[PDB]
């Protein structure tokens, strides 16, 4: 008596208040952000993110600042799981492109390979 049945895709775009252009014409990207190679820390590659497609930024006539016309340029949303990001994107009606998480491949490391009798992995300097 307090449970009804729906068989739909949970569309809330009419309740979000977003204009039609920023719903239909937008493409979001769902991915784990790549580790920047200037550092070795990997704490930033643990939460999934969706960002939006980049729109036009031009130069201000007066000062030369980076003027924009879109609202969803600084919009970054963080998620614990990829399927949670899919649920949020399909609920808000945005078409999504999803990149699978690029985990680093395990590799064999041995300090004694630097001092090999016959293999080419012997190093000439330290």
């Amino acid at each position: 008596t307090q449970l009804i049945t729906v068989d739909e895709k949970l569309d809330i775009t009419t309740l979000t208040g977003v204009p039609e252009e920023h719903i239909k014409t937008r493409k979001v990207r769902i991915f784990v952000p790549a580790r920047n190679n200037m550092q070795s820390g990997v704490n930033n590659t643990k939460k999934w993110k969706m960002e939006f497609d980049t729109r036009e930024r031009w130069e201000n006539p007066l000062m030369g600042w980076a003027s924009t016309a879109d609202p969803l340029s600084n919009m970054v949303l963080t998620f614990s799981a990829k399927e949670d990001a899919i649920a949020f994107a399909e609920k808000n009606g945005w078409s999504y492109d999803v990149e699978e998480k690029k985990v680093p491949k395990p590799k064999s490391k041995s300090y004694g390979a630097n001092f090999s009798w016959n293999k080419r992995t012997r190093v000439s300097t330290k």
């Binding site: 600042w65 609202p71 600084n74």
Partner: protein
Amino acid sequence: KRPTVRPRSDVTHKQLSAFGEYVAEILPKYVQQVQVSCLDELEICIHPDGVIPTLTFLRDHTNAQFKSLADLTAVDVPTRQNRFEIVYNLLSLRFNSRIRVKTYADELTPIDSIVSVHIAANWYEREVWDMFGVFFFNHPDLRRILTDYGFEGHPFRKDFPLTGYVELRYDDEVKRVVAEPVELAQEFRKFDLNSPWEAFPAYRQPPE
């Protein structure tokens, strides 16, 4: 002893844990979680349908007497199914204590308003509806309280942009203040201020 470390007391933690056990065993129908923080603060997380019995028990019980509602708010965590975590902060002047009651909701499941328990919940739930879009059942006058008249969207949600969608400017052709789509002379520069080295090993999550 340590001048740069905040002193801690275990007596308040023990009393709040005992009262958490007390409330959890009095109300097993709704209480889903009871936790006491390191800062000596008690939180009870409950089912959404038990907000009226939980608040009524905490206000009108002799051993609770939480007669003052400190605040009512919501937190938008858009990675869980019920994204709006609704928080009631309550004060007990008789026992000089503070308690936090948490519940959950999403964009299409309203919860019961507690205006019949606390009158400040009227304006606080109006603020919650205006900012997050959480509907409240049996509210006397649920409407917007902080946004502009005719404002579309709930701005304290995560997915809402910081600058919004429209701005106001005066047009002399129609002699009116009119709304236009957002254009900024200088765009808000997003800063990635997050170090890729782990800061707190006590909160290290297990890998996925």
